[PDB]
Amino acid sequence: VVANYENASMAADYIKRVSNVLPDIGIICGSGLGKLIEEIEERKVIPYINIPNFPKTTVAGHVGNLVLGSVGGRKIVAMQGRLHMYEGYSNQEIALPIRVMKLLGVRVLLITNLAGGINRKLKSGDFVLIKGHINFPGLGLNNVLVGPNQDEFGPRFPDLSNAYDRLLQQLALKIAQENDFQDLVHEGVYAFNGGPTYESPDESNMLLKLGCDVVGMSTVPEVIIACHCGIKVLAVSLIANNSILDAENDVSINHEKVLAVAEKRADLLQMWFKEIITRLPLD
Amino acid sequence: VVANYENASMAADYIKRVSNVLPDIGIICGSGLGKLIEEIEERKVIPYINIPNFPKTTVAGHVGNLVLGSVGGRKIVAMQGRLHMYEGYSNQEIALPIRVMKLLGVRVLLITNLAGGINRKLKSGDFVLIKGHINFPGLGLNNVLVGPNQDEFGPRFPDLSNAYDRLLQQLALKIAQENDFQDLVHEGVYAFNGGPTYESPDESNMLLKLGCDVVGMSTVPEVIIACHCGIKVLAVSLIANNSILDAENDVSINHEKVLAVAEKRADLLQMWFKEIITRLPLD
Amino acid sequence: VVANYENASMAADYIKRVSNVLPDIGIICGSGLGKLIEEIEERKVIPYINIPNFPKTTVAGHVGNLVLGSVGGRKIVAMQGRLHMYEGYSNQEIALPIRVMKLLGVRVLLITNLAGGINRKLKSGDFVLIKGHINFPGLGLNNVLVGPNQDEFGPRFPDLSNAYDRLLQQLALKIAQENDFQDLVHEGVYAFNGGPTYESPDESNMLLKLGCDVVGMSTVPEVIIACHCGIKVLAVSLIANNSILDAENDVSINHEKVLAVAEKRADLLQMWFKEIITRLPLD
Numbered sequence: 001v002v003a004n005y006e007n008a009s010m011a012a013d014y015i016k017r018v019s020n021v022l023p024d025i026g027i028i029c030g031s032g033l034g035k036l037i038e039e040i041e042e043r044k045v046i047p048y049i050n051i052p053n054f055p056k057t058t059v060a061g062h063v064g065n066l067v068l069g070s071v072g073g074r075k076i077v078a079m080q081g082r083l084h085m086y087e088g089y090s091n092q093e094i095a096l097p098i099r100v101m102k103l104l105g106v107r108v109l110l111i112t113n114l115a116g117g118i119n120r121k122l123k124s125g126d127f128v129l130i131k132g133h134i135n136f137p138g139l140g141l142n143n144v145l146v147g148p149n150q151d152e153f154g155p156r157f158p159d160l161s162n163a164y165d166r167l168l169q170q171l172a173l174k175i176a177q178e179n180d181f182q183d184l185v186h187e188g189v190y191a192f193n194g195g196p197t198y199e200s201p202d203e204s205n206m207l208l209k210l211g212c213d214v215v216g217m218s219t220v221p222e223v224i225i226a227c228h229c230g231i232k233v234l235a236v237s238l239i240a241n242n243s244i245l246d247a248e249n250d251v252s253i254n255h256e257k258v259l260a261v262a263e264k265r266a267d268l269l270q271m272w273f274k275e276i277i278t279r280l281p282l283d
Numbered sequence: 284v285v286a287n288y289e290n291a292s293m294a295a296d297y298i299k300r301v302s303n304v305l306p307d308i309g310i311i312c313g314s315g316l317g318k319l320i321e322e323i324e325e326r327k328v329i330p331y332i333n334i335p336n337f338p339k340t341t342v343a344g345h346v347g348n349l350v351l352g353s354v355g356g357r358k359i360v361a362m363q364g365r366l367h368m369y370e371g372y373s374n375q376e377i378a379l380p381i382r383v384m385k386l387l388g389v390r391v392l393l394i395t396n397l398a399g400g401i402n403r404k405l406k407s408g409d410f411v412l413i414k415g416h417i418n419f420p421g422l423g424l425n426n427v428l429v430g431p432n433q434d435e436f437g438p439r440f441p442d443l444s445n446a447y448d449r450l451l452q453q454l455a456l457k458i459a460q461e462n463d464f465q466d467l468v469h470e471g472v473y474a475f476n477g478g479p480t481y482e483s484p485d486e487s488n489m490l491l492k493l494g495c496d497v498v499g500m501s502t503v504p505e506v507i508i509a510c511h512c513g514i515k516v517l518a519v520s521l522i523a524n525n526s527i528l529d530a531e532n533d534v535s536i537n538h539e540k541v542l543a544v545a546e547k548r549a550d551l552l553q554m555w556f557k558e559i560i561t562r563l564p565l566d
Numbered sequence: 567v568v569a570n571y572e573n574a575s576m577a578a579d580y581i582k583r584v585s586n587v588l589p590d591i592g593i594i595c596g597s598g599l600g601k602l603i604e605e606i607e608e609r610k611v612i613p614y615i616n617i618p619n620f621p622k623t624t625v626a627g628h629v630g631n632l633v634l635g636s637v638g639g640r641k642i643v644a645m646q647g648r649l650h651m652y653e654g655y656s657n658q659e660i661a662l663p664i665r666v667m668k669l670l671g672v673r674v675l676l677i678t679n680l681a682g683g684i685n686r687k688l689k690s691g692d693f694v695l696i697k698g699h700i701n702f703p704g705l706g707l708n709n710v711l712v713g714p715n716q717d718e719f720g721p722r723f724p725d726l727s728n729a730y731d732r733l734l735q736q737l738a739l740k741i742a743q744e745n746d747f748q749d750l751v752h753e754g755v756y757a758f759n760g761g762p763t764y765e766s767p768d769e770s771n772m773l774l775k776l777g778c779d780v781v782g783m784s785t786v787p788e789v790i791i792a793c794h795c796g797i798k799v800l801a802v803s804l805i806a807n808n809s810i811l812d813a814e815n816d817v818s819i820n821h822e823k824v825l826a827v828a829e830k831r832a833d834l835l836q837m838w839f840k841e842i843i844t845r846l847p848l849d
């Protein structure tokens with residue numbers, strides 16, 4: 001299924017009928033960081049498998065629902081069960097849900113992820129407001145937009161200079177200051193490693209030399225599809241570990257350790273993003 | 284359709300019949316830089332769609348013709364409607380037209396493109412004679428030659444040390460000096476970004492650290508196919524903007540601005556390449 | 567054919583019946599470095615084409631056999647006819663033979679390759695014990711593990727911090743010292759260039775800036791599949807040429823020159839690896 005105007009429209013038509021929610025904000029949550037979705041009010045849970053033209057996710061298994069409802073007085077749509085490119089999903093499969101969000105009315109997409117810290121200032125449990133990226137798949141002919149352009153959504157050659165909205169980064173930082181956790185909050189450049197192997201020690205050392213502050217396996221594809229169709233983005237990485245320090249100390253990177261950091265910060269991140277949602281401009 | 288000897292031969296047989304032109308030189312022109320093709324003498328226009336085994340281009344649409352005729356006393360073949368890998372064309376689809384050029388008798392391929400400037404010396408409207416490249420798709424398992432080798436055209440492992448012919452670069456510079464526009468002409472290393480998103484500000488900053496002088500979304504695949512089958516190459520980038528300066532000044536990159544630079548330099552580039560063609564050696 | 571548990575089991579069942587050899591060690595040899603396979607004792611040669619679910623290799627042609635037998639008192643299985651990703655083999659085709667090795671009982675995989683030297687200390691004919699890697703395909707969404715995870719073999723997100731076993735590197739160096747060829751032996755980081763074009767002069771210069779010591783077109787995919795399923799790895803590069811020096815001197819890289827270096831060091835490498843095999847721990 002191509003992520004075109006007709007196919008995205010058919011999915012949005014189904015969702016509009018079944019949900020009766022017109023969302024202004026979209027959310028995609030990192031692993032272990034999805035509990036805000038469980039707290040959506042007046043919520044409507046729509047399995048991906050029920051939505052016309054949504055990507056098939058049964059090979060990977062696990063949860064796959066679109067959840068619509070109200071958070072902090074705003075109407076939102078959430079992806080419960082993120083699609084990651086290391087699973088083998090195509091460019092079309094990644095793009096269609098974001099384009100459906102656009103047709104549903106989403107103007108702002110909020111994204112969280114778990115990432116490795118490269119910059120020396122970053123400790124496990126820190127947050128990084130993403131201000132730019134290095135898209136290794138994109139440089140390497142695996143950009144999420146490779147393929148025919150879908151003109152109804154955006155231009156053939158998008159500029160990414162404003163992919164990460166500055167005002168949204170400023171609002172996120174302001175809320176952290178108001179709640180006295182700004183000492184945890186940094187800003188930085190995200191390197192997209194296609195994955196699914198963690199960054200090797202020597203890849204981490206290369207990323208250090210190349211300016212990269214954090215590395216992870218997601219986010220950049222969704223950012224690009226959103227930017228292409230005019231959706232503003234705030235993307236926040238939770239630092240699971242400092243990969244440069246771990247390489248210096250012969251310490252392994254491990255998904256169980258990553259998820260334990262997610263559990264440690266999950267409630268703070270939920271509170272933060274709920275307040276961001278309530279504070280977003282009405283326009 | 285595989286870009287093999289039999290299939291390329293079938294395309295060349297059709298072209299030889301319909302055109303009656305045996306070209307010595309091939310040309311592939313950047314966007315907005317194609318007007319020389321409109322000035323080919325005694326010309327024969329062959330739609331790609333009519334040529335056996337040529338790639339289907341109707342999804343992208345727009346023009347797709349092979350144009351044969353005379354420029355500056357030399358017999359040439361031009362691609363009117365370049366095939367770009369960000370459109371989703373396969374390695375086989377990119378390679379077949381160049382291999383057809385080889386079977387038609389092409390010994391020299393002239394290429395122009397529009398690119399972003401990384402080196403600080405580069406201003407909008409400058410020309411860069413490409414002297415080498417950094418092929419991010421190639422490093423990343425998306426080299427245009429991935430797949431079975433077609434032994435009749437070239438070796439399994441081509442060396443790229445002489446992919447950009449030195450004598451052709453020297454001739455291009457000499458003609459610029461004779462016409463007093465050598466102040467516009469630089470030389471440099473081309474980074475291939477698969478695209479189609481423009482280089483992000485942080486990707487540009489990385490390319491600066493990595494020695495790259497210019498960045499763009501084309502050219503390297505054609506250079507490699509030509510080098511593989513023994514065709515000499517001259518490749519010239521027209522600098523649309525300096526991406527490092529634009530990132531420092533929060534200035535966007537935009538295809539309309541790119542095309543306006545192409546329009547500003549199109550006539551000078553046509554005159555330059557016409558003279559290069561007339562001055563090429565007969566052997 | 568997916569490189570899953572059922573399919574790998576069917577291949578291993580066939581091999582166990584026909585060979586009567588239960589191997590503890592696997593070997594994959596670089597081009598021109600395969601003569602140890604010819605010296606396997608009590609050997610059983612099994613054409614890939616006869617093994618259920620093994621990848622089809624007839625388009626590339628050339629030899630394709632699994633060879634089982636005894637070397638230095640240990641039971642081994644060798645791939646005679648390596649599968650390279652620049653040929654177009656899929657992730658599944660690369661992974662299945664290594665996973666078959668795992669089901670056959672392989673605990674240690676020994677790998678050799680031919681590579682370009684980047685580090686200035688490296689001369690043609692030197693050996694590099696690989697201690698880490700920079701996986702450009704992996705960063706670029708072409709990691710050998712992209713696709714559904716096969717849980718029976720390993721985790722979704724492997725850590726590569728111990729992909730190159732330290733004790734095996736130490737044993738290899740110790741044997742070189744005992745035989746007075748330690749002056750040829752270095753250690754270093756391997757950059758994976760998908761290929762099949764040799765590293766361009768400017769790619770080599772970039773790799774120098776990025777810490778890389780050697781560059782080649784293989785090995786990293788097999789290392790990752792082995793690491794994913796718990797097989798320890800020793801990987802050794804034979805330096806065919808110093809690409810930085812060759813770029814400084816306008817000297818070409820050439821497969822015939824590469825193979826001549828392989829021939830010059832083939833007998834020493836066979837003796838070295840035979841002794842490594844005899845000296846490997848029984849556990």
Ligand SMILES: Nc1ccnc(=O)[nH]1
Pocket residue numbers: 114115116117193198199215216217240241243253258
């Ligand atoms: N160290 C890491 C943590 C989480 N995700 C990554 O890709 N890397």
Ligand SMILES: Nc1ccnc(=O)[nH]1
Pocket residue numbers: 397398399400476481482498499500523524526536541
């Ligand atoms: N800045 C740029 C201009 C043209 N092409 C590119 O890829 N980048």
Ligand SMILES: Nc1ccnc(=O)[nH]1
Pocket residue numbers: 680681682683759764765781782783806807809819824
């Ligand atoms: N210079 C090289 C020799 C062998 N293999 C490579 O990839 N490069």
